[PDB]
Amino acid sequence: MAAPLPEGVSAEAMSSALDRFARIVGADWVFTEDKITPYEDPYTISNDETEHRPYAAVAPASTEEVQEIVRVANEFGVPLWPVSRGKNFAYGGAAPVMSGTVVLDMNRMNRILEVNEEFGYALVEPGVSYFELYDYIQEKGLKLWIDVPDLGWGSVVGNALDHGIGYTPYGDHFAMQCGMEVVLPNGEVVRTGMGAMPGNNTWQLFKYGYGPYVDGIFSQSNFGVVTKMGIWLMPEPAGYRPYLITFENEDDIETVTERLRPLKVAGVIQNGATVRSLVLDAAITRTKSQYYDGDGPIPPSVAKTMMADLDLGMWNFCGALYGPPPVMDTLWTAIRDSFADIPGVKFYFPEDRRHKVDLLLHRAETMKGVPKLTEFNFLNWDGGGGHVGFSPVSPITGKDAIKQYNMVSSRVREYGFDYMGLLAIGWRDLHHVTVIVYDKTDPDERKKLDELFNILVDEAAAEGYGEYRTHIRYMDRIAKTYSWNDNALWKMHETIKDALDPNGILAPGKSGIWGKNRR
Amino acid sequence: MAAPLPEGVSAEAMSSALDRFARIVGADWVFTEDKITPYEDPYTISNDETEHRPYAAVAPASTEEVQEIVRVANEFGVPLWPVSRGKNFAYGGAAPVMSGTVVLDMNRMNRILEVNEEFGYALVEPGVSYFELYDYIQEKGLKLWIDVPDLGWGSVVGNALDHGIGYTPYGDHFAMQCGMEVVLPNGEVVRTGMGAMPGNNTWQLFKYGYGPYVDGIFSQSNFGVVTKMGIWLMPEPAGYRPYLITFENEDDIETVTERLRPLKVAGVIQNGATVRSLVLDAAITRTKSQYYDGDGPIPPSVAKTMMADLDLGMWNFCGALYGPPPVMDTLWTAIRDSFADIPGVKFYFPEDRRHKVDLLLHRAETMKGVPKLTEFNFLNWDGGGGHVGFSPVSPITGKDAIKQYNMVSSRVREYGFDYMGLLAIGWRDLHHVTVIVYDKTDPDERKKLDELFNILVDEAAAEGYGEYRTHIRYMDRIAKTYSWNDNALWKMHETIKDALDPNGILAPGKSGIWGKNRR
């Protein structure tokens, strides 16, 4: 039941590390036994209780405390798993790849250092939630919008660092980053970009500074602990019009994707708009048992009944227009005209929706940066479960979108799960995120889910498709798919890992990076 | 006369390396003795003939040749200076920081691998010029625009890697980079992003791939040799209207900058528009001798004559509108109304310019990505010179812009040069590039220029202002300005440098990064 020590670390070295942590942060902020529960992955996959088990957690309240924790980790060989808020649900929560790792929980580092209206940026510590930043802005009356993922309880910092996405024009969270403070694995502190200039007034204004542009190496990484991050924020626009376009046929995603490509590449679709499958959208407001008594995935009659009941299609394109009315009118003509000849297509603004509790009314808040927790509802689809994200990247091409749709949905449904797919529209790509809802308390369901997930990764890789982000359980497996020139890129990451973190004390296994002591 | 050997490298070691280079590339493509002259800085600053002298150059035609050159460099400890085209004029040309370095000239690697109209991207080798990419697009009738710096003979790759800028909405060249192939300092080759996925179709569509985001560490860097690079390209817009707004008073730049800020942060100003001083703009079509017979910088009465003769201001704001006419009309109303109340303001479209050879008619081409060589015209201003760029970063704030103007123009004029100032508007910053035109053939003028440059650096840094880019001569001095926490950031760069390049054979001194054998 209890976590094992990490390999190569004695009870004495662990015990000396945890006493030193308690001196740095205070005894109230070192969590070791009954108190480790929140750091376990909430959505279990393994049936092996020795896997992904944190030994303890430590909750610092300053950069100095993070530095001291990292120095102690080096002294005793005790590996850390840094998290900003640790809400990485469906990718492991706050749990580490390697059992015995100590979570470094930066929740209590929740200072909003600055929100600047005139330049549209925030400078935040890692414990700052989307709810907290949003509330600060509303309280101060600042004419800025934030960009939120579906769950507002996450970290502005942590989500961006994991290459997270939201649903406004600022939906590429890491792309909006500007300036960061990093505790390097030796416990030294650096500031990137203009933050390296003493007395600067440009840390959050100009990304590069001078010399190598290194901010990105601390994203999806174990090269450092990020303790402050700047992020650009969108000025409140002069107008906002959310829309939903629904498609009748699963096979419409091919032509729909062809039509989205020129609109997104030219920026006529201004936001990280989405195309969401029926069940993902139905599960926000309904449960399977309201339409079907069976244990399988839904049959076609059930899909069609849900579509007619909820005014949803098999595919649901949710986007928004932003700016002065004459600009929004022009963009709407180009978007509407692109879809208007597909048989079965329907166009909605919010005023056109029948239900008070409705997909479009919900996503209208998301696409103006309003944090919420409504998306958690899809976990009740089959009575209450966990989820995991299978998140391959696609070109914005109909051939690829319908290929991935067919490959993923056929397998998910074969293993007894409904298909719940998001196509998140990036600058030149789709993130295809399949959320697989399963009973995480049931060892037989966990076994099927694990087998299915390995199949989806292998079949996607055999088609030249890689994941952008993954669960702690599969980080090695995904690294091994990026194998060009005999794993050349991971050999370079391991070179950088050994130089910055020779003792391998930061997040062993994050993104399949281990360091020389554990390779 | 001849370059010295690099310190620590024997005549035998150099001779053995150069013979091995000739076996790799062919004896015709190793340049020594008289064939070295194009690799010298054309715009000399030092009065010491032993400084910034390349020993030789080698001109490979494939990534494989680049890899074998790098392996031989490691074997003999012979340092390389990689350039894509080596047209870095005003920052050293192709010349190295450290005398005795061999230039690794990638001009002959000039394949356009792909230009993709429907996804708006190109994949290019380092030798591809902006002319070549532009001409390929026009010949194939592809509906794409490129983004050019003022000089079209530079490298799409090399300019981006040095954080170069241009004048369309795609003006931040490095920001539009997607996917690269790098020869690491050990001679191994890696592909970043989705390039690491065998059989991918997403290298130029999704920046990150999976894991640490490293593309940035190879910009303004000596961490590797970039051999292929993707870049996003703008779809040809539905319309295009370039404009010039002129201001009568040198002090107008304070209020003008205050008004530019909200327009830029909200994206109403769609491109990397520019505010250029009178002399920089006058010098595109006139010489000082046509207005003034005096020895040094122009007096106020001569400025007023020039302004009325050319329809220029003390400050000239050159931008463009892009997209459908209703969009261009809406953005123009916001831009025009922001400046309308400034005494002495004048607004011009191309049809309003009375000169046939004119600043606006020239920059109208630049702001739709037409490569040209007309910007060298300003070098005629005082009878023929070279130039160096003093390039501090500023907030988009009136107070900062007028402070930098006063600091820089005072000192430049005091040392006998005219002030020629560009404020290139980025997303949240101004790049303030002062081009100092000087008689590069005169040791007394080079001594004044060198002393002036040192003063501009030290005075800017005393005000918390750092340069985004600099000349080879000043790379150490600029690195030493980014000194926060006892030079913490450069200690990290040196850690990564020693891990990737233990022999220190890539570009010692680039961005003030030397490697353990030479610091």
Ligand SMILES: *Cc1cc2c(cc1C)nc1c(=O)[nH]c(=O)nc-1n2C[C@H](O)[C@H](O)[C@H](O)COP(=O)(O)OP(=O)(O)OC[C@H]1O[C@@H](n2cnc3c(N)ncnc32)[C@H](O)[C@@H]1O
């Ligand atoms: C189940 C689920 C998940 C989900 C979602 C909807 C549901 C129902 N909607 C999402 C969305 O729309 N967009 C998105 O990007 N993610 C979405 N998710 C996934 C996930 O829940 C969220 O992304 C969530 O916000 C992530 O958690 P949080 O924001 O708390 O981030 P974290 O756990 O602290 O950090 C993630 C990992 O990054 C590394 N890390 C984080 N902080 C640091 C610092 N400061 N230094 C170094 N590394 C850091 C760690 O590897 C950490 O595990």
Ligand SMILES: *Cc1cc2c(cc1C)nc1c(=O)[nH]c(=O)nc-1n2C[C@H](O)[C@H](O)[C@H](O)COP(=O)(O)OP(=O)(O)OC[C@H]1O[C@@H](n2cnc3c(N)ncnc32)[C@H](O)[C@@H]1O
């Ligand atoms: C005098 C002048 C300069 C100038 C300009 C106008 C005038 C009159 N206008 C500019 C503009 O509008 N925008 C801009 O960014 N620069 C402008 N300049 C400056 C300069 O001349 C140009 O930027 C020019 O394009 C740069 O030269 P080029 O494009 O040929 O680039 P390079 O010399 O090959 O590379 C520059 C440095 O980067 C590193 N490097 C380059 N390639 C590699 C590869 N493949 N791998 C690793 N490092 C690389 C080197 O340090 C190289 O010296």
Ligand SMILES: C=CCc1ccc(O)c(OC)c1
């Ligand atoms: C409804 C799903 C939203 C979602 C978006 C992006 C993600 O990476 C993700 O991971 C589990 C979930």
Ligand SMILES: C=CCc1ccc(O)c(OC)c1
């Ligand atoms: C006319 C000046 C254009 C210009 C722009 C950016 C640069 O860095 C530059 O360097 C000298 C020159």
